[PDB]
Ligand binder design. Sequence first.
Ligand code: AMP
Ligand code: NA
Length: 353
Amino acid sequence: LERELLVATQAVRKASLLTKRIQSEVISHKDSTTITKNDNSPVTTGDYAAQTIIINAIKSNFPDDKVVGEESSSGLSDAFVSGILNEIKANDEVYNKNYKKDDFLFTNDQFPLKSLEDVRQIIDFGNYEGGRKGRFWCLDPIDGTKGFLRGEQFAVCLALIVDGVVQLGCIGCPNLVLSSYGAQDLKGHESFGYIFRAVRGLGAFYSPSSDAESWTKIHVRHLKDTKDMITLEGVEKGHSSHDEQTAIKNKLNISKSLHLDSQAKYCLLALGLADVYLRLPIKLSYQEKIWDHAAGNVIVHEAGGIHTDAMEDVPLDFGNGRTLATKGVIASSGPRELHDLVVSTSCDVIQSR
Ligand SMILES: Nc1ncnc2c1ncn2[C@@H]1O[C@H](COP(=O)(O)O)[C@@H](O)[C@H]1O
Ligand code: NA
């Protein structure tokens, strides 16, 4: 999967810079850069620009490839689309001065990414429904859009699924400063953060996004007692059952928690800076989206961790379409005894409502 990893990495890299660069402007013009979707969730110029860069890179390199992307261009006005295009081109002017990759194409004759109709066409390639067989890309162009809009953590996530199993993942964390989580930062991290990646069977690695050439292997840690561990949880109260997560902590004597938006959580897990990622469901009717977890799935696995749902303690199934059929998500450092204690506690807490 050599070409695929290169494409994915460069695609995320470029989109990581664009999204980092525009975060403030988006926030400041949060009347004209942001749209509300049918569930009231937000989507910005940044989300679409990221999606455009990424899909255009995939399609330039792999013309027939299928993509499951959360966004679609229907309804986007020309003015809105012109703003997406302008951000891509401004980003290119900065990006090409320092980060061009030799012998790598983001655009070609078939997909030149020059017009508003090109933009629309590329966005609209994200409409695959996934499923059990064959190869397809899974993208969350801005992962944790509320984190983005709060000026806090967000990520840019891409994965390749083949026959329902995630084979490759790439997560850009443009605002992730390791010194905030008790770790050292690497040279070059300050321009646009870090990129994390893994291929099934080949290990998990990271690099500053500005580098993306020299890769450092990462692995979860293994603390022996739960009273020393650290949880990872989201910030948004509506995205997970915080009170039930607290019950879990209290039962396990955990007194250290980190809250942040996006799959950057899986990256901190995989680096060994925390131990248990909790994502219990508030409502059992919710079906988790694959693009919120697929990149992280393979990164955690290759880092030596475990990833299941939050009730049954079964592995997540990335072949069910756009959603996970199970309820909630729990990831940890493992071993299995730690993981199972956590998930069984979650199960019991939920059942006791
Ligand atoms: N009710 C919900 N339960 C779980 N996840 C949700 C819910 N509503 C939205 N989300 C997802 O939360 C993701 C961001 O996760 P996070 O930053 O970890 O809180 C988004 O990309 C949404 O798809
Ligand atoms: Na998103």
